Amino acid sequence: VNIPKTRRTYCIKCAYHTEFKVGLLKKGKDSPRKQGARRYARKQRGVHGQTKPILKRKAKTTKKVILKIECTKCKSSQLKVRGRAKHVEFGAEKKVKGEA
Amino acid sequence: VSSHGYRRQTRNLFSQAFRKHGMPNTSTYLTQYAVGEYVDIKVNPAIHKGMPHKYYHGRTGIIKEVNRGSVIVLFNRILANKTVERKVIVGIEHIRKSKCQDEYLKRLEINKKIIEEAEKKGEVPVLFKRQPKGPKPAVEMLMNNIIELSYDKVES
RNA sequence: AGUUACGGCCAUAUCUACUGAAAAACACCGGAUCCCGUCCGAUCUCCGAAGUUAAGCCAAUAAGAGCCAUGCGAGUAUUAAGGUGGGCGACUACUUGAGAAAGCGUGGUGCUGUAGUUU
RNA sequence: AGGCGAGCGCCAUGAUCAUCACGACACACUUGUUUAAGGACAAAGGCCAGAUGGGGAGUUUGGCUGGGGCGGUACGACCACAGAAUCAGAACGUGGUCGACCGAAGGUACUCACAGCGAGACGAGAACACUCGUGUAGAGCAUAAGGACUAAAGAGUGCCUGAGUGUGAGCACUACUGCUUGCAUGAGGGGAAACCCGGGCCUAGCGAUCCUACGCAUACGAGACACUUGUGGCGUGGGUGUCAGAAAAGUUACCACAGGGAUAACUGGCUUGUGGCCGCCGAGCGUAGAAAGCGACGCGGCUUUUUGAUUCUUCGAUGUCGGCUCUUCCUAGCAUGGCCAUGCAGCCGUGGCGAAGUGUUGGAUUGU
RNA sequence: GCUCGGUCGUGACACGGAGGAAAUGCCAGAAAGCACGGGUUAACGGCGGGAGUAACUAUGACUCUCUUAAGGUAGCCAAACG
RNA sequence: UAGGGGCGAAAGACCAAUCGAACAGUCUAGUUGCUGGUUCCCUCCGAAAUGUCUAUCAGGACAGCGCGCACGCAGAGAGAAGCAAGGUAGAGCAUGGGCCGGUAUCCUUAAGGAGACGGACGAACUGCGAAUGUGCUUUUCUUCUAUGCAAGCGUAGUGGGCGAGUUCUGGUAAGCAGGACUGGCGAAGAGGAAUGAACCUGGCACUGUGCUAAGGAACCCAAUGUCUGGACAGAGACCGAAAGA
RNA sequence: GCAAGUUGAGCAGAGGAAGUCUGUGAGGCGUAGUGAAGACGGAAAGCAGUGUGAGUGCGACCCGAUAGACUUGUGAACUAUA
RNA sequence: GGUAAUGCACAGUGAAGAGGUGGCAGUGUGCAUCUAAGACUAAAUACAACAGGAGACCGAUAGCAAAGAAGUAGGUUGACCG
Numbered sequence A: 001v002n003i004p005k006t007r008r009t010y011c012i013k014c015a016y017h018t019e020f021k022v023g024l025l026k027k028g029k030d031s032p033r034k035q036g037a038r039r040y041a042r043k044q045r046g047v048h049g050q051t052k053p054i055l056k057r058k059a060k061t062t063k064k065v066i067l068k069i070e071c072t073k074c075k076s077s078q079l080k081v082r083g084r085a086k087h088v089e090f091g092a093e094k095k096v097k098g099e100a
Numbered sequence B: 001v002s003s004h005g006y007r008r009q010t011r012n013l014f015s016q017a018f019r020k021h022g023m024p025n026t027s028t029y030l031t032q033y034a035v036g037e038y039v040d041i042k043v044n045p046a047i048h049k050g051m052p053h054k055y056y057h058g059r060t061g062i063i064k065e066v067n068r069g070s071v072i073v074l075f076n077r078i079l080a081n082k083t084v085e086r087k088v089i090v091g092i093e094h095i096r097k098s099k100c101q102d103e104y105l106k107r108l109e110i111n112k113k114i115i116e117e118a119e120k121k122g123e124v125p126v127l128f129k130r131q132p133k134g135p136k137p138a139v140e141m142l143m144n145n146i147i148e149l150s151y152d153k154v155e156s
Numbered sequence C: 001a002g003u004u005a006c007g008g009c010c011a012u013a014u015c016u017a018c019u020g021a022a023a024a025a026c027a028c029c030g031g032a033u034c035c036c037g038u039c040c041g042a043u044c045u046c047c048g049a050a051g052u053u054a055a056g057c058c059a060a061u062a063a064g065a066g067c068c069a070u071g072c073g074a075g076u077a078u079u080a081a082g083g084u085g086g087g088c089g090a091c092u093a094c095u096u097g098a099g100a101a102a103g104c105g106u107g108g109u110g111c112u113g114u115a116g117u118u119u
Numbered sequence D: 001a002g003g004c005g006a007g008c009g010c011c012a013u014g015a016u017c018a019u020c021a022c023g024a025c026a027c028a029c030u031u032g033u034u035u036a037a038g039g040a041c042a043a044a045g046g047c048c049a050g051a052u053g054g055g056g057a058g059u060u061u062g063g064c065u066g067g068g069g070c071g072g073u074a075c076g077a078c079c080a081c082a083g084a085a086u087c088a089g090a091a092c093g094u095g096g097u098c099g100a101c102c103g104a105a106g107g108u109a110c111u112c113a114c115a116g117c118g119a120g121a122c123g124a125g126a127a128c129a130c131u132c133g134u135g136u137a138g139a140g141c142a143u144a145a146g147g148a149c150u151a152a153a154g155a156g157u158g159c160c161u162g163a164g165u166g167u168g169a170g171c172a173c174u175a176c177u178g179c180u181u182g183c184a185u186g187a188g189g190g191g192a193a194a195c196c197c198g199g200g201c202c203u204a205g206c207g208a209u210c211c212u213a214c215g216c217a218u219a220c221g222a223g224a225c226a227c228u229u230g231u232g233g234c235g236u237g238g239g240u241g242u243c244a245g246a247a248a249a250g251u252u253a254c255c256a257c258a259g260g261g262a263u264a265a266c267u268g269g270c271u272u273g274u275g276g277c278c279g280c281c282g283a284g285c286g287u288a289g290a291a292a293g294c295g296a297c298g299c300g301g302c303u304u305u306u307u308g309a310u311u312c313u314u315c316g317a318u319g320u321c322g323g324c325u326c327u328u329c330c331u332a333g334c335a336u337g338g339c340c341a342u343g344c345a346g347c348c349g350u351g352g353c354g355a356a357g358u359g360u361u362g363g364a365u366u367g368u
Numbered sequence E: 001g002c003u004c005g006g007u008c009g010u011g012a013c014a015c016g017g018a019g020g021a022a023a024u025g026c027c028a029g030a031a032a033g034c035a036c037g038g039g040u041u042a043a044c045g046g047c048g049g050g051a052g053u054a055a056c057u058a059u060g061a062c063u064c065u066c067u068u069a070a071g072g073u074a075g076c077c078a079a080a081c082g
Numbered sequence F: 001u002a003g004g005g006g007c008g009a010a011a012g013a014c015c016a017a018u019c020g021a022a023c024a025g026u027c028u029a030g031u032u033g034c035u036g037g038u039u040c041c042c043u044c045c046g047a048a049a050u051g052u053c054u055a056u057c058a059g060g061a062c063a064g065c066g067c068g069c070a071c072g073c074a075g076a077g078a079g080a081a082g083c084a085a086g087g088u089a090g091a092g093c094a095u096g097g098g099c100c101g102g103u104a105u106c107c108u109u110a111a112g113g114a115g116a117c118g119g120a121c122g123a124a125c126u127g128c129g130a131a132u133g134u135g136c137u138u139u140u141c142u143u144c145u146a147u148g149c150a151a152g153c154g155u156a157g158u159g160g161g162c163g164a165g166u167u168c169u170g171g172u173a174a175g176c177a178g179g180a181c182u183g184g185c186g187a188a189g190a191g192g193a194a195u196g197a198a199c200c201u202g203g204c205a206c207u208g209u210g211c212u213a214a215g216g217a218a219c220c221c222a223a224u225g226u227c228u229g230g231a232c233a234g235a236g237a238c239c240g241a242a243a244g245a
Numbered sequence G: 001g002c003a004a005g006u007u008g009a010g011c012a013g014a015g016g017a018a019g020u021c022u023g024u025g026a027g028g029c030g031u032a033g034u035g036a037a038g039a040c041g042g043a044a045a046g047c048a049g050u051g052u053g054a055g056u057g058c059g060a061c062c063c064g065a066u067a068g069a070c071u072u073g074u075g076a077a078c079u080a081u082a
Numbered sequence H: 001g002g003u004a005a006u007g008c009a010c011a012g013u014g015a016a017g018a019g020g021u022g023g024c025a026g027u028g029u030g031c032a033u034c035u036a037a038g039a040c041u042a043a044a045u046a047c048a049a050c051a052g053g054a055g056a057c058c059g060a061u062a063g064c065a066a067a068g069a070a071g072u073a074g075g076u077u078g079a080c081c082g
């Protein structure tokens, strides 16, 4: 699947159509200071073994394509969801018809 | 085993009749509908928006609400041994005006005359009910021109 | 009464040969300078009247093909209810009811709405 | 505080604190070398942290199934067939498909067809490019199957990113999911305009609570006030295919317990494919000649003595193969008695009929 | 599997470093192991297929071909092992 | 030398008639979706063995079918009369699949091929199309109806079914395995088929007199005789095929 | 029984007394809802008892495992070995 | 219950004379409230043996195991059992 690097679309904050910059969303790093991390650290602490379950019988191959789009004027962001695909490319050459 | 998609088992239903393929006729689009009319559903397979589920094909119901190019029709259905009302959205290409009230409306037109006179002259209407066909009538016959019947045909 | 513009129901209107047609139209027809579009003024777009009923459109003809109706096929095929009916079965007779199709014969061959024009 | 290369890093040595070997003493510590020998090492204790660890400890080792196991997946989805013409409707019933793919194969406006067949046109042939006439789809429509489509939904050509943003109501047995439809908005798109568009012509391509990542504004914050961290709310992603969602390998012939004829290993019952026995027909063969004796290719039966198929009875128990011993019954007749046919000279036979009274043995190898 | 040698890399806590008002984080550091190179079967164990070819026929000493960590030697056999 | 321990010329042998983990006592009345049992009378009403989800298949929960209390009340497991939808039985072989033979004529060969046509066919072929069954409106439409219906609230049992008639799928079949429709036995006695869960007649408080059903009427055993044709086989009343004199 | 209200909380005063009568006097639920919250606000008789059907937890209708653990409890008079 | 530590310990480290706390981690600053690392204390509260009084309790297969010479007759190698 090929996606262009730019898209003119409606910006909710500006309340009219504007140019946006287009790219794949990126998963950030887990923080030790959140309530879930704190709870788990304390529970693991003693001689208690493994205290929470871990998935082993996994089954899926792909994961869903998700695009982050940024408004060039006001820097606000929107998230667009596009379904499952094994491979993704940004800004490659057009699928020109009637090749040799 | 069978499957359970939205258009399961519709090979015979949802197919055009012989020498009747193509889009609908102008009369379909120029018919005006109103709340409270009785209407009859027959799906046109060539139109892919506003199709009802195939249970409703060939059933008749009553118009509840009217929109730009679609209608909402009320139906009743038995589920788990109880009666349930159902509100079905249909596009105007898949409906035709029902004939089911025709005779009753004629009868009302006759009643509407009598019920006025019944205030002036009588006290109660005669009301013009239908009656089922009675016994066989009496006959007077001239008795010339007799025809005899016989087992002449041997039927080898 | 036809035609023509815009229609309704979508073959009684289709397909193949032939033949007719006052008037007014409808056409074929004559050019590309411009607007517009082509490998190509063939098609599409524009500007025209020297010609012509040869064509189309309209109408007639044909033991024509196809379509539409009706009669017959036929109370035939199949079928609902019933009995301590029959048959080793496969299946089938009877009593009170409902009731076809293909073939084949005979007839048809568009009907109409609103406006405009022509003895 | 010195020196090098167009104040930089690089090369010299001079002051300031830890610090690793090596020596030489004896004071901790060690040893019945004890009025002694070793010596800050050893050996022995303590607190944290990595590695190894069936030596042990706990526990687990899905379901459906013509009994279980091995095999398949009828375990989540989609089309067609059948189920005596609404809808629904079982079996490890039938023919198949799915866990994706695509900036166009998405949205709009306009133009024109196609597969073939009959004539033509140098090289040029069965099969090269160009034309004329016919052409209801005999073609195409990415990917199963069905349905749909003709001045198009197919093939080309132009422009666009609606594969917008808030918030309602409903349909499929309706939670998740998929689709249909209302109102409001965009310094939205395509088209002259009427019209159409919030993915793919329609029916399939998918996933809760808690935790965590990101986007969006509006909240909270402990006696008070400021900031760095944190906690709330809505929406999407990260995943459970056993697909309405536990974190999981074997073996027991040393074996235990609760139950089951809801379910196997005998017999019996129903069935008779397979096993065995009998009829019908007459192509050919028999030295001539269908039929003394045979009888291809086909067709109809009977039996329960073989082995299957099924699970009705028994799992708080019906003692399981063969032999020994002893009795009775059946006939589809091997001998013995009476007869008929003959390819019956006689002798020996072969095919059939009524008949179950009396007979049908001794041994070698082998559990048979 | 056991055993021997070196690090070239990884690999804990402590001990340091930079920054910030401070917490939390970040960076360095890092034995033995692991990786890497050798030894070892009276350690666990393991030890092949296909074609042609000799003056009757058969059989193949001989040849070619695929393959490996090595392709079952000396003996023994329808053996309590066919 | 003592129990997750001993001892063993090794058999999981032996450790007070106990050993593939001793005895005593306690926690403890451990747990059980599994087996057994569960104590007086009469009156009235009366089921289910099906759907969805479940580490679910000998169990649950939700819904469906009972009963009790009942605010209230024009309704109905039947017909007519207008109106819709359907692709089965029959019938056919016009698109698609597909068997055998063709006159004239045509094409070549001097073979064969095509053919104006006839016969034979499909669960996944259709050009036509029933009966029976399904839904809508009308009491302004016959006929019944209070000793009747009944929202709502609370709560039970059930979730192994089996059989007849008519039909269907798998299988050589089966008292075999699995669906659909209308009544049964389950939970149903009485009279009849000699006997039999389900077949025929026909639904049960307690007495008395009459009458009929189904099935019987020489005798067993309450009631029996008549007329007309067939039939001779230790036949038939109870009973098997193709083939035959 | 009382009703926009209601109640035997504990505890005090009286009384030849485990009864009864009287006080003082909390709390709880109700008198109207909406949101996570900041915040806002606009329908519906309740409270306490005496009993019956029914759910959940405790031995939980009655009887019934093979097993698991704990003791500063016992045993080599049978049998094993020094 | 105590949630970026409610209390108690062990090893390293280790104060100030001024310190501790104000149910969410950190740094600063006012405000409120207390004074740890030494000791003693009545009343109102809990419950066997033994004694006394009561009861909608049981009545010799019941009620404590035991209404008489009952933890007895009797039993285990023993602990213990009855």
Ligand SMILES: [Zn+2]
Residues within 6 Å of the ligand: A011, A012, A013, A014, A018, A071, A072, A073, A074, A075, A076
């Ligand atoms: Zn913006």
